[PDB]
């Protein structure tokens, strides 16, 4: 499948929308530090078995 | 490759951290050690330190 | 034991082939709903320990 | 106790040459002391002095500090550098927000600031802007605090304002109000003995602090620090912190971490529910009797609680230990 | 708002005359200022008969 740029990134908290918009890209003028997200992106991969 | 991409230009401002390679104009190489308060550097008859 | 084996056998851990509500309900007389009752009770127990909580992420 | 002779120092003529430069002479001084106090005071003055300095600036229509503005010859960073040297002197506060509106052709100084009744501006002639077109207009809410010793924005990564808007620009802070500090011993013509000196302390400040409260605050810090040089009990630390959480550490976090609606968040803030340690042990019986909390709000809570693994309205009569 | 006090204090007497004293909690330059001050006090401004 294709990889989409979204804000629905799994296993995230309020730090997500804190810097990122409704889309998944941080606002122009936002202050970031080591670890934060700049572009929300997810890649498809099922299986895994667990 | 495939699909859309996002570039994020973020600008940072670095101060003279202890270890930066700084030199003169006559092959005067040098690397800064410590930082040192103004309170304990060589001064003269006036308040002017170095 | 009637809760550890229940949790272990259902989600199939340390025994390879995992079984279902029936294959576990048959080996413990009372079928289906009864075993699911216990299965949910064991999950109830894990709501204070922090070990598996942090292991989550 | 009965030993020693010794003398005492006392302030003479504090010659105020200008609003910045100052000279505080100390005449009643011996030989050894007049040279010893010279360094103690010089360091505490060239460091451990109070003062004020800009920390935050929010400018309309300007997000980050790298942008510009129409009608402004200077760019935003430069205007942030000019506000660095704001000679401010606040009366009896720890934080003030001076507003600064100014429109039309011409240079915008520290005068175009809203003259507050508490803020005392040393040099209103100070440069900050330079509007160009007559249709150009600016307005910036400035923030000034009281502290000590440098401490830039780089120190506070995000330990202030959990949200802090896009428009808020952090500026560094040069707290100490003493530019240079010098001193000469010199033989004192004390109309008394013969072998005494007069510690002359040539001084240069910014005008945001007077030589009176300056040398006193300075010597006061030396005294307070010498205070421990008296007795020597050699007090150690007990240490030995407890390494055994009786409950899940998550119960320590506030309900903000639940990430729920504003209506439900305000309700929890009104029912005196701060930590999740109280929401986890509150029944639906008590949640229905809560002002402005209907079916949608209650479903929100159980869904944001269950997902974290926790339940709703459990019991744990161990709340809270144990500092 | 103000300043801090030195808390951890150690004193080892390598006899009755020779000794070492260490005070850890001190701000910038204070250790040296108090050093020069107390040094300049102990090397002349002290009483004693000879």
Structure token digits, residue D68: 């510009």
B45 reaches E (C-beta below 8 A): no
* Domains (range + CATH), chain C: 1-57 (1.10.10.10)
Q: Count of residues for chain C?
A: 57
Evaluate whether D182 touches D159 at the Cβ level (below 8 Å): no
Structure token digits, residue D212: 């009176």
Any residues with CB less than 8 A from the CB of A40 and at least 6 apart, and which?
Answer: A5, A6, A7, A8, A9, A16, A20, A23, A24, A25
Evaluate whether E28 touches D225 at the Cβ level (below 8 Å): no
B8 reaches D (C-beta below 8 A): no
Which member of B2, B3, B8 has the closest CB to residue A39? B8
Any residues with CB less than 8 A from the CB of E9 and at least 6 apart, and which?
Answer: D228, D232, D233, D234, D235, E21, E22, E23, E24
Q: What is the dihedral of CA E24, E28, E30, E31, to 10 degrees?
A: 40
Tell me phi and psi for residue D15, to 5 degrees.
-70, 100
Which member of D157, D166, D257 has the closest CB to residue A30? D166
What does the alpha-carbon distance between residue D77 and residue D69 come to, in Å, rounded to a whole number?
A: 11
What does the alpha-carbon distance between residue D202 and residue D24 come to, in Å, rounded to a whole number?
A: 7
Rounded to the nearest 5 degrees, what angle is found at the Cα of D136, between the Cα atoms of D135 and D140? 145
Give the gap in angstroms from C-alpha C20 to the nearest C-alpha of chain D. Answer: 24
Cis status, amide bond into D322, omega within 30 of 0: yes
State whether D43 and B11 contact (CB < 8 Å): no
DSSP β-ladder status, D168-170 and D137-146:
unpaired
Looking at beta carbons, which residues of chain A come within 8 Å of D157? Answer: 33
Q: Of all helices (H) and strands (E), which one includes residue D169?
A: strand D168-170
Structure token digits, residue D257: 């971490």
D203, with CB counted inside 10 A (0-12, 13-18, 19+), is: buried
- Number of neighbouring beta carbons within 10 Å of residue D199: 23
**Cα C52 from chain centre:** 15
Structure token digits, residue E27: 């701000």
Which member of B2, B6, B10 has the closest CB to residue A25? B6
A 1-50 → B contacts, CB under 8 A: 2-3, 5, 25-26, 32, 38-39
Tell me phi and psi for residue E9, to 5 degrees.
-130, 125
Looking at beta carbons, which residues of chain D come within 8 Å of B39? Answer: 42-43, 46-47
Looking at beta carbons, which residues of chain A come within 8 Å of D63? Answer: 27-29
Which residue in chain D has the smallest CA separation from E49? Answer: D4
Residue of D225, D233, D238 to mutate, interface with E, max E Cβ within 10 Å: D225
| Touching subunits for chain D (3+ Cβ pairs under 8 A) | A, B, C, E
What does the alpha-carbon distance between residue D148 and residue D176 come to, in Å, rounded to a whole number?
A: 6
State whether D259 and A27 contact (CB < 8 Å): no
What does the alpha-carbon distance between residue D273 and residue D301 come to, in Å, rounded to a whole number?
A: 13
C53, with CB counted inside 10 A (0-12, 13-18, 19+), is: middle
DSSP β-ladder status, D95-96 and D52-59:
unpaired
Nearest residue to D76 via CA among D86, D62, D88? D62
**Cα D277 from chain centre:** 33
A27 reaches D (C-beta below 8 A): yes
In sign, the C-alpha dihedral spanning D122, D125, D130, D134 is positive
Looking at beta carbons, which residues of chain B come within 8 Å of D204? Answer: 47
Evaluate whether D30 touches D7 at the Cβ level (below 8 Å): yes
Q: Note whether A touches B: 3 CB pairs or more under 8 A.
A: yes
Nearest residue to D27 via CA among D44, D7, D41, D45? D7
Rounded to the nearest 5 degrees, what angle is found at the Cα of D19, between the Cα atoms of D108 and D77? 35
| Touching subunits for chain A (3+ Cβ pairs under 8 A) | B, D
Looking at beta carbons, which residues of chain D come within 8 Å of A28? Answer: 63-64
Any residues with CB less than 8 A from the CB of D143 and at least 6 apart, and which?
Answer: D54, D55, D56, D57, D95, D96, D97
Nearest residue to D260 via CA among D316, D202, D299? D299
State whether C47 and D309 contact (CB < 8 Å): yes
Tell me phi and psi for residue A27, to 5 degrees.
-65, 140
Evaluate whether D154 touches B20 at the Cβ level (below 8 Å): no
DSSP secondary structure of D44-69: HHTTS---EEEEEEEETT--STT---
Nearest residue to D154 via CA among A31, B36, B33? A31
**Count helices and strands in chain A by DSSP H and E runs:** 1, 0
Rounded to the nearest 5 degrees, what angle is found at the Cα of D137, between the Cα atoms of D152 and D53? 20
* Domains (range + CATH), chain D: 1-50+176-229 (3.30.1360.10), 51-175 (2.170.120.12), 261-323 (1.10.150.20)
State whether B43 and D182 contact (CB < 8 Å): yes
State whether D47 and B39 contact (CB < 8 Å): yes
What does the alpha-carbon distance between residue D313 and residue D273 come to, in Å, rounded to a whole number?
A: 13
D182 reaches B (C-beta below 8 A): yes
What does the alpha-carbon distance between residue D167 and residue D156 come to, in Å, rounded to a whole number?
A: 17
Cis status, amide bond into B16, omega within 30 of 0: no
Residue of B8, B9, B11, B13 to mutate, interface with A, max A Cβ within 10 Å: B8
B41 reaches E (C-beta below 8 A): no
- Any alpha helices (H) in D124-275, and if so which ranges? 211-226, 262-270
Whole-number CA gyration radius for chain B = 21
State whether A28 and D157 contact (CB < 8 Å): no
Question: How big is the B-D interface in CB pairs under 8 Å?
Answer: 26
Which residue in chain D has the smallest CA separation from E38? Answer: D36
């Amino acid at each position: 499948g294709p990889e989409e740029i979204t804000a629905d990134i799994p296993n995230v908290g309020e730090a997500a929308l804190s810097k990122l918009d409704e889309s998944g890209i941080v606002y122009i003028g936002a202050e970031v530090t080591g670890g934060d997200i700049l572009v929300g992106k997810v890649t498809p991969k099922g299986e895994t078995q667990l | 490759g495939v699909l859309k991409i996002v570039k994020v230009y973020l600008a940072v401002k670095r101060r003279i951290q202890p270890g930066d390679k700084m030199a003169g104009r006559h092959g005067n190489k040098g690397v800064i050690s410590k930082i040192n308060p103004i309170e304990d550097m060589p001064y003269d008859e006036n308040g002017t330190p170095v | 034991a009637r809760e550890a084996k229940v949790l272990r056998m259902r989600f199939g851990i340390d025994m390879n082939t995992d079984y279902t509500l029936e294959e576990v309900g048959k080996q413990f007389d009372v079928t289906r709903e009864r075993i699911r009752q216990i299965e949910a009770k064991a999950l109830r127990k894990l709501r204070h320990p922090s070990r598996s909580e942090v292991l989550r992420s | 106790g009965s030993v020693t002779e010794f003398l005492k120092p006392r302030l003479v003529d504090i010659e105020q040459v200008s609003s910045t430069h100052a000279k505080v002479t100390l005449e009643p001084l011996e030989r050894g002391f007049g040279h010893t106090l010279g360094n103690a005071l010089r360091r505490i003055l060239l460091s451990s002095m109070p003062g004020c300095a800009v920390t935050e600036v929010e400018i309309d229509g300007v997000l980050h500090e790298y942008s510009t503005k129409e009608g402004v010859q200077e760019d935003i960073l430069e205007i942030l550098l000019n506000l660095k040297g704001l000679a401010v002197r606040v009366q009896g506060k720890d934080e003030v927000i001076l507003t600064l509106n100014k429109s039309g052709i011409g240079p915008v100084t520290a005068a175009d600031i809203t003259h507050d009744g508490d803020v005392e501006i040393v040099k209103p002639q100070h440069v900050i802007c330079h509007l160009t077109d007559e249709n150009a207009s600016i307005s910036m809410r400035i923030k000034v605090q009281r502290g000590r010793g440098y401490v830039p924005a780089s120190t506070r990564i995000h330990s202030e304002e959990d949200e802090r808007p896009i428009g808020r620009l952090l500026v560094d802070a040069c707290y100490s109000p003493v530019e240079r500090i010098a001193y000469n011993v010199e033989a004192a013509r004390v109309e008394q003995r013969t072998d005494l000196d007069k510690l002359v302390i040539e001084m240069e400040t910014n005008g945001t602090i007077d030589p009176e409260e300056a040398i006193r605050r300075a010597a006061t810090i030396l005294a307070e620090q010498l205070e421990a040089f008296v007795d020597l009990r050699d007090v150690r630390q007990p240490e030995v912190k407890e390494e055994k959480p009786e409950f899940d550490p998550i119960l320590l976090r506030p309900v903000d971490d639940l990430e729920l609606t504003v209506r439900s968040a305000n309700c929890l803030k009104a029912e005196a529910i701060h930590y999740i340690g109280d929401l986890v042990q509150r029944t639906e019986v008590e949640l229905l009797k809560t002002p402005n909390l209907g079916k949608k709000s209650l479903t929100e809570i159980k869904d944001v609680l269950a997902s974290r693994g926790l339940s709703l309205g459990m019991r744990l009569e161990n709340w809270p230990p144990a500092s």
